[PDB]
Design a binder for this molecule. Structure first.
Ligand SMILES: Cc1cc2nc3c(=O)[nH]c(=O)nc-3n(C[C@H](O)[C@H](O)[C@H](O)COP(=O)(O)O)c2cc1C
Ligand SMILES: Cc1cc2nc3c(=O)[nH]c(=O)nc-3n(C[C@H](O)[C@H](O)[C@H](O)COP(=O)(O)O)c2cc1C
Lengths: 200, 198
């Protein structure tokens, strides 16, 4: 198996899958504009049903006139550490398809497909030497109103991206959590032939 | 800017993001059991809200007693080509959690998180020299029934995984589509400061 990033996999996974993680101690430095565009470019190369590409990204750099708005759209707990990230953005998805004639049909996969784009985002960030950190502790209705998100678009998650620094900058409770998370055994989620896992 | 796999990126992305794609011409060869486990192990390392890990994967190898069933759970247009993949599986997500005291709570991010696991699956497949192909043209209610999926678990997608072969094996309409797909300009989906698209 693989040993990497204080994690051990049961099978020889690429170390990239263990090395990608979501810390909270960010150094508050500026990220080059092209680096963020590369990250979002990788994200937008994700697969999606019918190649509909339902994801959207609304982003702000730490030097933005709207940085404080992006910070205050997160819940207080997340603000405490995410305010020191280099970039904040929201991952959004179109919850329908719309035709040339403006006819709307509910999308069965838009959130799923947005998640693929988000992993791609996190992976590209990782590859450039950054860490991305997903957030659901966010004010979704305020995001929609303040960021002019049109009807039929869903806020999936916030994302903080930055350069990792020493945990000492964190309050003690977060510093204690600054360690890569573990996973359940593969056999608890991967079943041959039929669903053999417990329902709970 | 990056050029790879008959695709061109606007920004210098890792060529892995361009090289990963979803062909339909598969060679029907057996995939080693450990290779599929490595793929799903990568998938299960995805991030998820609260580290709930809501994904499940139900899989069969082409050599399987279950293969005919797995093939028949795909719509006909998918069967035509996916029946020649090495592995077929369904990505499933748990739509809820339950407290110590028994209170069921809907999960807001379970499909989104499953999607992250699916990209991870597809990327690890790619890195081992295979190709994964996602499928929504599937019989979900029949999948739930036949594969004994419990209540509160959602079928997200089918996935075919295998080893690419010459497109000549495909019917013409699919042969024409056996090329790496394109994307909208980045600026059409990435907006600074405010949502400005459409
Ligand atoms: C959609 C989603 C929402 C998340 N929301 C939060 C959050 O609001 N606050 C937080 O500290 N972490 C949040 N996370 C981080 C997860 O807890 C983390 O990704 C998970 O524990 C796995 O750890 P890893 O990403 O380091 O592998 C979220 C992750 C996902 C993908
Ligand atoms: C959830 C989803 C559902 C899909 N359903 C089908 C389908 O049923 N039939 C098919 O041939 N391809 C299907 N695909 C393939 C997509 O059309 C394909 O991933 C997209 O055009 C982008 O191409 P790429 O993955 O080669 O980069 C599906 C993909 C996604 C992720």
């Amino acid at each position: 198996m693989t040993n990497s990033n204080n994690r051990q996999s049961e099978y020889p996974v690429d170390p990239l899958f263990l090395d990608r993680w979501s810390p909270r101690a960010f150094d508050g430095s500026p990220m080059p504009k092209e680096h963020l565009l590369t990250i979002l470019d990788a994200a937008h190369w994700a697969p999606s049903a019918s190649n509909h590409q339902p994801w959207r990204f609304v982003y702000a750099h730490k030097d933005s006139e709207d940085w404080p708005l992006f910070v205050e759209l997160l819940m207080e707990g997340n603000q405490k550490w995410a305010k020191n990230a280099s970039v904040l953005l929201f991952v959004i998805s179109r919850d329908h398809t719309i035709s040339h004639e403006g006819e709307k049909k509910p999308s069965a996969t838009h959130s799923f497909d947005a998640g693929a784009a988000w992993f791609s985002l996190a992976m590209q960030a990782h590859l450039l030497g950054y860490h991305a950190h997903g957030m659901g502790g966010i004010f979704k209705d305020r995001i929609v109103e303040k960021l002019d998100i049109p009807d039929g678009f869903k806020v999936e998650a916030g994302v903080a991206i930055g350069t990792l620094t020493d945990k000492s900058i964190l309050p003690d409770d977060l510093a204690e959590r600054e360690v890569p998370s573990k996973r359940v055994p593969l056999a608890d989620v991967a079943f041959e032939g039929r669903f053999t896992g417990k329902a709970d």
